[PDB]
Amino acid sequence: MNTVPFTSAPIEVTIGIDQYSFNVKENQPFHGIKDIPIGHVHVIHFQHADNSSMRYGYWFDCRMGNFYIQYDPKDGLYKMMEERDGAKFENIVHNFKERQMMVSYPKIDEDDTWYNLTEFVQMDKIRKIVRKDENQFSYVDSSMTTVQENELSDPAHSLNYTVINFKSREAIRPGHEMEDFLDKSYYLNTVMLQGIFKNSSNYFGELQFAFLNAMFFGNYGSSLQWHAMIELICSSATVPKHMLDKLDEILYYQIKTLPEQYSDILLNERVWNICLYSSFQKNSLHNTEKIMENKYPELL
Amino acid sequence: GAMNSSNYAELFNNDIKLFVDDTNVYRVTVHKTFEGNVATKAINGCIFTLNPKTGHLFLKIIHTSVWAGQKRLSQLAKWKTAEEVSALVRSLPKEEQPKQIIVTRKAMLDPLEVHMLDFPNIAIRPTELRLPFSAAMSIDKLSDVVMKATEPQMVLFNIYDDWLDRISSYTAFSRLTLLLRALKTNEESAKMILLSDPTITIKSYHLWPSFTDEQWITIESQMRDLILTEYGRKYNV
Numbered sequence: 001m002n003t004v005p006f007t008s009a010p011i012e013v014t015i016g017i018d019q020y021s022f023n024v025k026e027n028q029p030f031h032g033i034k035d036i037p038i039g040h041v042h043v044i045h046f047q048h049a050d051n052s053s054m055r056y057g058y059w060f061d062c063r064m065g066n067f068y069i070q071y072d073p074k075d076g077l078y079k080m081m082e083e084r085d086g087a088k089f090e091n092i093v094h095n096f097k098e099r100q101m102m103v104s105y106p107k108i109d110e111d112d113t114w115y116n117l118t119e120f121v122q123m124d125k126i127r128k129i130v131r132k133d134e135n136q137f138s139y140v141d142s143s144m145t146t147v148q149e150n151e152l153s154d155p156a157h158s159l160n161y162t163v164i165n166f167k168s169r170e171a172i173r174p175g176h177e178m179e180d181f182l183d184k185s186y187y188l189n190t191v192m193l194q195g196i197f198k199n200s201s202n203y204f205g206e207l208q209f210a211f212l213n214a215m216f217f218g219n220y221g222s223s224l225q226w227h228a229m230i231e232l233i234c235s236s237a238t239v240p241k242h243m244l245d246k247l248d249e250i251l252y253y254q255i256k257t258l259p260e261q262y263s264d265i266l267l268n269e270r271v272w273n274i275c276l277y278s279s280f281q282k283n284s285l286h287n288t289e290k291i292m293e294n295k296y297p298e299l300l
Numbered sequence: 301g302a303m304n305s306s307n308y309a310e311l312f313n314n315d316i317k318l319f320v321d322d323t324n325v326y327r328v329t330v331h332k333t334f335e336g337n338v339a340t341k342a343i344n345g346c347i348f349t350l351n352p353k354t355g356h357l358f359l360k361i362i363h364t365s366v367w368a369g370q371k372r373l374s375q376l377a378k379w380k381t382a383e384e385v386s387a388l389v390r391s392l393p394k395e396e397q398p399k400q401i402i403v404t405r406k407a408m409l410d411p412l413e414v415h416m417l418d419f420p421n422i423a424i425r426p427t428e429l430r431l432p433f434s435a436a437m438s439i440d441k442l443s444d445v446v447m448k449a450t451e452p453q454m455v456l457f458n459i460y461d462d463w464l465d466r467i468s469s470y471t472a473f474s475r476l477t478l479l480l481r482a483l484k485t486n487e488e489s490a491k492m493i494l495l496s497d498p499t500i501t502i503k504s505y506h507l508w509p510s511f512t513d514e515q516w517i518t519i520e521s522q523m524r525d526l527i528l529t530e531y532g533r534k535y536n537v
C-alpha cells in the first residue's frame with residue numbers, strides 16, 4: 001500500500017481520492033492519504049472551499065514514483081510533485097503515519113468499484129492524452145478543452161482524445177455513404193479498432209478515462225468523448241461479442257457510480273435513448289438498460 | 301443556416317445555388333393483391349434540382365429499375381437523390397458548381413451532407429419556405445419525359461421559358477411558385493386556366509404558354525382566385 005503525503009493544507013478544500021472525498025479545513029493538520037491500493041491508476045482531486053470554480057486534480061500510479069502534494073501560494077493550487085530522494089520520502093511518510101496525520105484510503109474489501117471503473121485505464125495512455133512529458137502524473141481540470149473542441153485554444157493544455165466525427169471522410173468510405181452512415185461498423189472496426197486503438201482494451205481505456213474526467217471535473221469535452229465512443233459501438237451492426245458484453249459491464253458500473261444529482265448534466269438523453277432503444281445494440285446491453293431504467297427513468 | 305422569408309432575396313443574388321426537391325423520387329401506386337393483401341408498384345420518378353436565378357432545371361429521371369431488390373425504399377430514395385446531386389455537382393465545371401444547396405425537406409440534410417463531404421465549402425441548407433415543387437409532375441412535358449423513360453436519364457429544362465427576357469428572377473420565381481401552388485391545390489382547374497384559350501399555345505421549346513405581359517397578369521389573378529376558392533372550399537369560408 002502506497003502513500004501520497006501533503007506538505008500542509010493551507011486553504012480549506014474538499015479533497016477527492018478516486019470515488020471518495022473528504023473536507024479539510026484551513027490550516028488543519030492534514031498530511032496526506034495512506035493505504036492507497038497498488039495496481040490501479042488513481043486520481044487525487046480538489047475543489048477549493050472559497051472558489052468551487054475549477055475542480056482540478058492529478059492522475060498517477062504509485063508504482064511509477066513517489067508523489068506528494070504541496071500547496072503553491074503563487075499559482076493558488078495544490079500541486080503534485082515527485083520526490084526523487086527515496087530515503088527522504090520514506091522518512092517523511094513514516095513520521096506522518098506515526099503521528100496519524102493521514103486519512104486512510106477507505107476501501108471496503110467486497111468493493112470492486114474502482115477496479116471496475118479503471119479496468120482498461122493505463123497511465124501510459126493517460127500521458128498521451130494529457131501531454132506534459134516532464135511529469136509522471138497528469139493534471140486535468142474542469143476547463144480544459146479537447147483537440148476536437150479546439151477545431152470547432154492553447155494546444156499545450158488540451159485533452160488529446162481520439163477525434164470521432166460521424167460526418168467526416170474518415171468515417172465514410174467513397175461509394176458506401178449510406179451503408180457507413182447508417183451502420184458505423186467500418187468506422188469502429190477498421191478505422192478505430194484496427195487502425196488507431198489497435199485493440200478494444202485501449203478503446204475501453206479511453207472511454208473509461210473520458211467518463212472519469214467528466215464525472216470528477218465536470219469536464220464537458222470529456223463527456224462528449226464518452227458519449228461518442230458509446231454511440232460509435234451502439235451504432236455498429238457488427239461488434240465482437242466480447243466487446244458488447246464488456247461494454248455492458250463498463251457502462252453498468254459507470255451509471256451505478258454517477259451521483260444521482262448530476263445525472264441531468266452528465267447524461268445525454270439523445271445518445272442513451274438511441275443506444276438503448278433504437279440502435280443495433282438496443283438488445284445487447286442488458287445490465288446497463290436495467291440500471292438506467294430503474295435509476296434514471298426520467299431521462300428515458 | 302435555414303432559408304426563410306427574412307433572407308428571401310438571397311435566392312436571386314449572384315452566388316450559384318440550387319434547390320433540391322426529393323418528393324417525386326420514389327413514387328408508387330398502392331393496390332390489392334389477388335389474396336386481398338396490399339402491395340405497391342413503383343413508377344418512374346424524378347429529382348427536381350433548380351437554379352432559382354437562371355431557371356435551369358436539372359431533372360434526373362429515376363427509373364423503377366433502381367429500386368429492384370432494394371429494401372426500405374423511402375430511406376434509400378434520400379441517399380439515391382443525395383448520390384445523384386453529388387454526381388451532378390462533380391460533373392459541372394468548378395465555376396458552375398453551387399455555393400449552396402437548399403433542400404426542401406429536412407430529411408435530405410444528412411444524406412446530402414454525407415455525399416458532399418468532398419465539398420466542404422458548399423453549404424447544405426434547409427428552408428422554412430413551403431415550396432410547391434412536388435407539383436412539378438403536373439407540368440405536362442415534365443411528366444411525359446419521366447413516364448416514357450426506359451432507363452435513368454438527365455433532362456435539362458429552363459422552367460422559366462423566356463420570361464427572364466422581360467422580368468426579373470425574383471418575379472419569375474414568384475410566378476413559378478404561384479403556378480405550382482395552384483396546380484398542387486386544384487390541378488384540373490389550374491390546367492383549365494392555363495389552356496382555356498386555344499389561341500395561346502406552348503412553343504415546342506417551352507413548358508408554359510406564350511402569354512403576353514397583360515395575359516400573364518390575368519392568368520396570375522385567376523391562379524390567386526383558384527387558390528383562394530379552394531381555400532374556401534377546404535375550410536368552408
Ligand SMILES: Cn1cccc1CC(=O)O
Pocket residue numbers: 175176177178179180376379380383
Ligand atoms: C450507392 N447508393 C445509393 C443509394 C444507397 C447506396 C449505397 C451506399 O451509398 O452505400
